[PDB]
Amino acid sequence: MHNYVIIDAFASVPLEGNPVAVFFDADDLPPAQMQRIAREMNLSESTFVLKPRNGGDALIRIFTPVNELPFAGAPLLGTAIALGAHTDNHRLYLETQMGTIAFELERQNGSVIAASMDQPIPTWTALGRDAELLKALGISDSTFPIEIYHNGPRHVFVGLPSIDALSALHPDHRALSNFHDMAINCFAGAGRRWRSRMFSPAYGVVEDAATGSAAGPLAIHLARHGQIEFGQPVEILQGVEIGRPSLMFAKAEGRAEQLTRVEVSGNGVTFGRGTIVL
Amino acid sequence: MHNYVIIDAFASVPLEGNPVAVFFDADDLPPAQMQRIAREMNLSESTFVLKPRNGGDALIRIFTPVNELPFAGAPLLGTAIALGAHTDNHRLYLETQMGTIAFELERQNGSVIAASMDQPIPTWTALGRDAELLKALGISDSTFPIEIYHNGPRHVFVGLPSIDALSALHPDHRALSNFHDMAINCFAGAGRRWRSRMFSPAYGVVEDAATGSAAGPLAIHLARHGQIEFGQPVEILQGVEIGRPSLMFAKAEGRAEQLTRVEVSGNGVTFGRGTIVL
16 A cells, blocks of 8 residues: 655645645655556646655656656645655755755654745757747737746746736647647746746646746846846736646746756645555 | 867866867768878867758768767767858758767857757667676676676776765776777766766776767666666766766656657867867
8 A cells, every 4th residue: 555645736725726636655656657547636647756766865757647747847846745754854955857956855743734945957049930830829029038948848038028917828728739749838027026937739738836846047137038037036927717726936046058057946735645555 | 261169068068068169061071081180189070061962961071080980979969069050940950970970059148058969879789798897997796787788889888886886996097908999877866866987998988088989888787787877868977086077967768669759968168279280
């Protein structure tokens, strides 16, 4: 048998944020079994907590219902939060396919309520499919350059001139299906406070609750394009239009050419707990 | 006249990794001239960028100081990185003697900092010269089976029980000279993180900085022998003992009998740029 929890990542209230199922003591499950269990659960990801192999605290494997992922932001945040229920340590070092990701855990009376991670440092380039993408979204132009970032998954960012315009978007999901192995992240805001909507037929999501792996890239994008500085944090509110509001905090330190840290943090809360029969 | 750059492949810092000289606009150079220029430069390889002949983006010819090679990992990575300075494309398709090798380029502010290639799928067998090889290396036994892989060059892998033992190796380079048309790759590590040293009198190298064409084979070797799974990436650190640390990332997808992809990736950095008078 295995124990699991369901953590709503990037939320402090259940039924908000982005759910992840976290399976404990998973060393007796072969990867094919892990994939089957992820399919059974049908959450956007399931994670599996394994003994470390390279000096970290645990090795985490991440599965969608149909494949294994090298990196994912919300699922790793939720795993850190879930695991921090079983450790007293302040920092947690989670081994993944992209290497060991360092988390800082934040508690109140022994319960982990939030965590902060150092993400992989992304790369980026111009999408070079602007007219096609804008058509698909139903708008004429972006504010800022349409660039695609890679940190495992790929995210494209399209800027809107107000939060109302972002909310008004009604993309052609069929036309967005021609954009393979990426997610389309639309954003609007000012100063410290930004809003985001993410759509990805490629990653099997109509509209996402919290795209944790896009938060870091978005901070970089906003700093490069002069809306914030390198080293300044932003608050990114996502998921409002699907009723899964999700709050991601991000900061990109250094400069574009030499980034030293990409920090993303958020709250998490337990939605449920249970046990499976295998 | 021709322009060239010197790229340190499998490094992000100059004077680390493995240098390659990359010559642009080489269509006016006959192959005998290319060989002379490679001899002049005396780098482990020089590459020459030619117009494509089969639908790729460019045709790349690869020369050591004394012969043409059908395939080489570090030199092709360095060429992709150098060329990506002159294209906006995300993917680069480089024609070679073994066929067209697909690269994904990774940029920051227009500069290509890293790339990933799909390598030829190797073949392998038992070396069947274990006592002789072990004698030459100065050790009694390998950890894992002593197997030789072929993907153009041939690499043999000998496993050591700790990184300290690997570092302590002092091979008899004269005794290694009886091993023709191959390189001897010694390795140690665990989990995601491995160390390698490569010696090859046959290929005219006392000790290599980054043996890019051995990284893929090593991932296969480790998966076949149960140290990693098929589909899991490894980080391979090579060259430390000669002060040319080199970081190669590799992953072998499928299974031993039906490999579907052998991915090898790394950083690269420009060491220098110049022009020749012919």
